[PDB]
Amino acid sequence: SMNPPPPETSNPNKPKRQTNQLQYLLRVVLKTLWKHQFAWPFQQPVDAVKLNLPDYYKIIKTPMDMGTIKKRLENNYYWNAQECIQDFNTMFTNCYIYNKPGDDIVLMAEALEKLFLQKINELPT
Numbered sequence: 001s002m003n004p005p006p007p008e009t010s011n012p013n014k015p016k017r018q019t020n021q022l023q024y025l026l027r028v029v030l031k032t033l034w035k036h037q038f039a040w041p042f043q044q045p046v047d048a049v050k051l052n053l054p055d056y057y058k059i060i061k062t063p064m065d066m067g068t069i070k071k072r073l074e075n076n077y078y079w080n081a082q083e084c085i086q087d088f089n090t091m092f093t094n095c096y097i098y099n100k101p102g103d104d105i106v107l108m109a110e111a112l113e114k115l116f117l118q119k120i121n122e123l124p125t
């Protein structure tokens with residue numbers, strides 16, 4: 001099976017704005033995660049064809065990745081900083097749903113999540 005289409009990253013019919021918190025999420029939170037040694041499996045959508053994960057999209061129905069998150073932040077897709085935070089937590093959660101405890105991939109997610117939460121705890125008002 002092919003992969004599914006990637007999540008939406010721009011919508012004409014969705015209102016759009018810029019916030020202080022949305023800047024921190026891009027300029028601080030995404031940047032820091034993006035440069036982490038274990039960030040690479042999360043920088044684009046799960047390619048089940050390339051990675052030979054034939055059931056990935058049978059089990060995961062709400063895919064998300066940092067690649068999408070970046071695009072969404074750059075095209076002003078988000079209205080609320082809460083929407084963006086939900087996207088990160090979806091990404092992490094999918095990992096933990098699909099994979100077993102201790103698989104390499106889970107350890108790489110858990111390392112990034114630790115860092116995510118550290119940065120989210122210093123989000124501005």
Ligand SMILES: Cc1nnc2ccc(N3CCC(C(=O)NCCCN4CCN(c5cccc(Cl)c5)CC4)CC3)nn12
Nearest residue numbers: 038041042046051053094095098099104105107108111
């Ligand atoms: C995204 C995503 N969601 N589910 C999956 C399943 C596989 C998958 N890939 C992409 C990455 C592949 C993988 O696990 N590669 C890891 C390389 C091996 N390293 C081994 C050592 N390592 C590591 C990471 C965290 C803690 C510790 Cl101690 C060592 C870093 C990772 C397996 C195939 N991506 N994925």
